[PDB]
Structures are given as structure tokens and as C-alpha cells.
């Protein structure tokens, strides 16, 4: 047997960041010096080990999370980082030990009008605990006065769209991200 990485990478449709996907792996040796070259990869950074001595190891359990963010937000998928995405969408723990993979997908997840399938959570009262996935679409209460689930002033829908135009700058273009955990 081998390890399936074509599944989580070459998947035809990807997940939104707030509702990120987690795939488990329970296999034999995995080809990591071989992913570094398996394609071009605008980001390939590991926070637990030298990338060349991954093939010379195997683990108790390995997870692959995938989602889409914006490029200037890819820097947030790393330990000890704060911001709109790490606070409210996908936190990595501080002792995170693993590797972070991302690449431009302007031709896949954009459309000329602007592809809006992909969402993020903008409002939350508290930060996410690491490896937390919060999927509630409950009206966010910005005020003293409570909402009871009606959008209005100080009563905001917590999820907002990404506007993905092919016209965008690199920071605002969609990047697909895969996070290998150990």
C-alpha cells in the first residue's frame, strides 16, 4: 500500500475556511520530499521537522485539513499568529508540529463575476481554540440589545463572502491550503 495524497489535493471542489475539512490518514509511508516537487507550491513550510527527513519517519496519527483563504491571509495559517482568520476561522496551536501547503487557484475558484461559494466568519466574541471548527450561522449580537435572530442594526450575519474576481491583486486572490498535522 501507499498513502493517498491525490484525494485531498487534486479534489475538484474545495471547502470554505470556517467549515474546513479534516481528512484522517491511517496508512504506510508517505512521499513528502515527493510533494515538495509533486507540483509548484507558492508556500511549503513545516513547523516541526526538516522536510527532507519526513520520509524517514512515521506517526501515531496524521490529519490533512483543507480550505480556501486569500493570499495575504495565507500567512495566518502558522503557529502563534493572530488575525481575522486565525482568531475566528482556523487556529493552529502554538506547539503545532507539521507542515503547511498552499498554492494559487485563481483559475479554479474565481469566476468573472466573482465566485461567492467561499465564505469566512467575520464576527465572533471569542477566539477559536486550536483545531476548532465553528459552523453556526447565528445572528451576531454587536449591541447591548439582543437580536433574536433578525438581521438589523448591531445584529449582523456572522459569515461574509469572498469576492473572487480574476481581476484581483495577488493578495485578494484565492489560495487553496492544506495543513498536515502530527
Amino acid at each position, epitope marked *: 500500500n501507499l498513502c493517498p495524497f491525490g484525494e485531498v489535493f487534486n479534489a475538484t471542489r474545495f471547502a470554505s475556511v470556517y467549515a474546513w475539512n479534516r481528512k484522517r490518514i491511517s496508512n504506510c509511508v508517505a512521499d513528502y520530499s515527493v510533494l515538495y516537487n509533486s507540483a509548484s507550491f507558492s508556500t511549503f513550510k513545516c513547523y516541526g521537522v526538516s522536510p527532507t527527513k519526513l520520509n524517514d519517519l512515521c506517526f501515531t496519527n496524521v490529519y490533512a485539513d483543507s480550505f480556501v483563504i486569500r493570499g495575504d491571509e495565507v500567512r495566518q495559517i502558522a503557529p502563534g499568529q493572530t488575525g481575522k482568520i486565525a482568531d475566528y476561522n482556523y487556529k493552529l496551536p502554538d506547539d503545532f508540529t507539521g507542515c503547511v501547503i498552499a498554492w494559487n487557484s485563481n483559475n479554479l475558484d474565481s469566476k468573472v463575476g466573482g465566485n461567492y461559494n467561499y465564505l469566512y466568519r467575520l464576527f465572533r*466574541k471569542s477566539n477559536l481554540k486550536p483545531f476548532e471548527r465553528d459552523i453556526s450561522t447565528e445572528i451576531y449580537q454587536a449591541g447591548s440589545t439582543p437580536c433574536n435572530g433578525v438581521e438589523g442594526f448591531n445584529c449582523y450575519f456572522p459569515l461574509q463572502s469572498y469576492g473572487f474576481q480574476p481581476t484581483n491583486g495577488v493578495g485578494y486572490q484565492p489560495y487553496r491550503v492544506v495543513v498536515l498535522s502530527f
Partner: antibody
Amino acid sequence: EVQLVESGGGLIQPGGSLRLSCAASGLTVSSNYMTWVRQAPGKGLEWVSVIYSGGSTFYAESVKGRFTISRDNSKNTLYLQMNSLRAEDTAVYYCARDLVVYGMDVWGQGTTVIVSS
Amino acid sequence: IQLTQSPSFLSASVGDRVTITCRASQGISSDLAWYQQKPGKAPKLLIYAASTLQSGVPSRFSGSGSGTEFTLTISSLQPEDFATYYCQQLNSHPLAFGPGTKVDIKR
């Protein structure tokens, strides 16, 4: 009523320190992106600091270290602690609420900070 | 991301149709807001999402633009409308404002 009422501006020698208050009403500051903006005389607006509802704070590179943004959930107040003040810190300091995707709808009256010796 | 405005100063008289332009360094599709500021006073939000009317804003103010070039439009200028107008990138973390466009009384 929906207000942000500021206070604490005045006259300060260079290197000194000053603390600006934003007293909110109509919106909870603990629950919001609150932001400090300034306008140097005869100049446009300029972002100073922002604090997120979960507590992350970010700063304009020109004020990293010197300034400190803070909040007091009990008093419903946002703070800007200005340290190591400079002649280029002279400005009107504005306090605003940021619905990031919906603009900055609620501003403060403004408060003037003159840095001179 | 850096923002610019074409008429630094704009001559116009009561009744006229005025147009201000904001140009963004790279592409930020429809993430723009428009503020109006009179002297001594706090900025007032006018437009968000580059074209939506902020609530309570007179309907003579309008927004167009997507990608990299945006326009604020006052269809019939009024006495109340002489002020400076700033664009801003919709953001939390850095806040890009425009330099400002001042609208003169024509002479």
C-alpha cells in the same frame, strides 16, 4: 443613543505620554472591531490602531511600541495609551466602530493632541 | 494597498452632477467605502461595498466601481454637500484611506 464620546486630548511635551478615552453608548466595544484614526493638520485620515472583539490588537508601523490600545468591558470604554510622543503625533484622534464589510458607521467627535515643548 | 483620488480639488456649483474617482494599487473587487468630512467634523460614512447606500444617506449619493477604479457620484449637488470626500479599503487590519477630494464652490 449611538455615540462615541472622546476625551483626554490636550497639550504634551515630546516624549511624554497621554491616554485617550472613547466612551461608547449604543454599541458594545468588547464585541466590536474598534479603531483609532488620526488626522494630522491639513492631512487626510490615517489608521493608528485596531482591536478585535476576541482581543487581537494591531498597530500602524509608525506607532508600534509607543501606542497601546485597550478596552474596559465594565465601563464600555476604548483606550489609546500614547507613549514616547512626538512632534509628528500632533493631530486630531478619531475613534470609530468598524463593521469590516459594512464600513465605519459610528465615529467619535474627535479629540486634539498637540505635542510641543 | 494604496488609494488615490483624481481631483485633489473639484469645482462645482449647486445643482451640478459631480464625480470623484478612487484608484486602487491592485485589485480589491468592490471592497470600498466612501466618507464625507466637513471641517472640524467627524467623517460620515456614505457608501459601503462600493455601491450600497449607507442608511440615512440622501439618495443623491451613488457608488460605482469594481476591481481597481471606483467613482462616487452626487447627481444634483446641494449646498449641504460641499465637503471633502475620502475613499477607504474595507478592512480590519491596515486601513487605506484615499488622499481626499475637496469639492469647491465654482467661480
